[PDB]
Amino acid sequence: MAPGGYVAPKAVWLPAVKAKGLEISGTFTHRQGHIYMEMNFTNKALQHMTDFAIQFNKNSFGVIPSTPLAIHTPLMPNQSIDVSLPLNTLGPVMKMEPLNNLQVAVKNNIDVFYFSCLIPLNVLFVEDGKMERQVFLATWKDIPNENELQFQIKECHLNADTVSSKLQNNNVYTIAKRNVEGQDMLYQSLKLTNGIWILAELRIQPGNPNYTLSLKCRAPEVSQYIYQVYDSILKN
Amino acid sequence: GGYVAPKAVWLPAVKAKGLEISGTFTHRQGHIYMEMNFTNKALQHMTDFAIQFNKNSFGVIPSTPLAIHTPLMPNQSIDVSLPLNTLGPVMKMEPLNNLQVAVKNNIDVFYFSCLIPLNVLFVEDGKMERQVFLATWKDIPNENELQFQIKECHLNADTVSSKLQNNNVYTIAKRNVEGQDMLYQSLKLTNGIWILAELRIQPGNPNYTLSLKCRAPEVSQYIYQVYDSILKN
Amino acid sequence: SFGDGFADF
Secondary structure, three states: OOOOOOOOOOOEOOOOOOOOOOOEEEEEEEEEOEEEEEEEEEEOOOOOOOOOOEEOOOOOOOEEEEEOOOOOEOOOOOOEEEEEEEEEOOOOEEOOOOOOOEEEEEEHHHHHHEEEEEEEHHHHHHOOOOOHHHHHHHHHHOOOOOOOOOEEEEEEOOHHHHHHHHHHHHHHOEEEEEEEEEEEEEEEEEEEEOEEEEEEEEEOOOOOEEEEEEEEEEHHHHHHHHHHHHHHHHOO | OOOOOOOOEEEEEEOOOOOOEEEEEEEEEEEEEEEEEEHHHOOOOOOOOOEEEOOOOOEEEEEOOOOOOEEEOOOOEEEEEEEEEEEOEOOOOOOOOEEEEEEOOOOEEEEEEOOOHHHHEOOOOOOOOHHHHHHHHHHOOHHOEEEEEEEOOOOOOHHHHHHHHHHOOEEEEEEEEEEEEEEEEEEEEEOEEEEEEEEEEEOOOOOEEEEEOOHHHHHOOOOOOHHHHOOOO | OOOOHHOOO
C-alpha cells in the first residue's frame, strides 16, 4: 500500500508490431492531487524517433493532457524512456463504451498511431469524498431501489479495519460501521472528478471468503466499474 | 444532399516528398466516393498513381483503380472522385471509423490514415416501422443505451428532422410530452446494423438529449458525432 | 479531429 493508492502495473497499450517499431506501455496514477498517465516509450525500429505528440479523444470524464508531450531528445533504436504525462478533467466530454475507455492518438516522425486503454476509476476518486453521516442516510433512503446494484468481492480475507484503511488510501471513506451477528457493515462514500457521489454498504461475513458490496448512485452506470476498482484495491 | 465534411489534409507534402492529398467522403445518389485533391509540390512530374485500402471496420474498398492517366506537373492539382463499395475485407479498426490507406506514384509508396464520417454509410432504406421500433427499443438491454448532448443547438424540431432526413436519418414518430418534444428516429448502416434514436427537445433548453440503442453499442459515439455535425451545419 | 491521421495534429 502506497500514498496515492493502488497503481496497476504497466500494460502494453501500443505493440511495436502495430506502430512500425514504437512500443508504448502504460498505467495511471493519482498522486498529491494530480492525475498522471505514466508511460514507457520503446523504440524497436532501426531508425531514431522524434517529433512526439499526443492527443486524447473526447471521453466520459473529460480527461485530457495538461501539457504537450515534451521529449526533447531523439529516441534512439532500442532506447526506452519513462514519460509522466499530467492530466486534468476539464476537457471535452463524450460518453465512451465501455464507460472508462480512453482513445489516444500518438504521432512521431513516422506516422500517427491510435490505441485505447481503460482508465481505472480510482484515479478519478477525489480527496473530498467523505460524506456527512446525516446526508448518507437521507440520500440512501431517497435514491430509488432501482439504482441499487449488488456485487460480490470474492477470495478476500482482510478484516474490517484493514479493508477500511486500504480503501481510505484510495479516497473511499468509511463514515460508519455496524456489527450485527458476526457481520461487519461498513457505510462508505466516494466522489468522482465530475461531481458524482457513490454511496456504498459493504458487508463482511465469517466463514465467508467473500463480501457483499451494495452501491447506490444517481448515475448507476458507473457502479460496475466502481466494483472492479474495490476488487482490485482489496485483492492487491 | 447530405452533410459533407470540409476537405482535410490527409497527406501533407513534407511527409510524401511533395505529394499533398486533401480529401473528404461523399454519398451521392446511393454511391460512396472518396473525394480527393492531389497537388504536386515537388519539382518532378508525377505519374503511376495507385491507391490501396487496408482491411477496415465497414469493408470499405475502391470499386476501381484510381486511374490518373495525364501526368501531374509541379504546382498543378487534380480533383479525383474515387467510387467506393462496402463489400471488401473486414477488420475492426481503432478508432472504429479510421481507415488506413496507401498511395503510390512514380517516386514512392506513402501510408496515411483518414476518418470516415459514418453518415456516408447511412443507407436510403433506413426508415423503421413504428411497431418494430417500439418493440426493439424495449427489448434491447438498457446497458446498450448511450446518451449524448447536442449542445447549443438553435434549430426547431422540424429543421432537425429535415436536416437529418437529408442524411438518411428518419424521424418515424414525433411525440409531445408536457411541452417536451421527443423525436423517434432510425437509421441503418451499409453493413446491416440498425440504430434506434430518441431525441429530446425541451423548450427553454438549447441542449437536446440524444439517446441511442443498438445491438452493437460501440458504434454509438460515431453516430452521435456525425449527428452533431449535421445539426451544426 | 480524432481519427483523421496527420490532420488530427
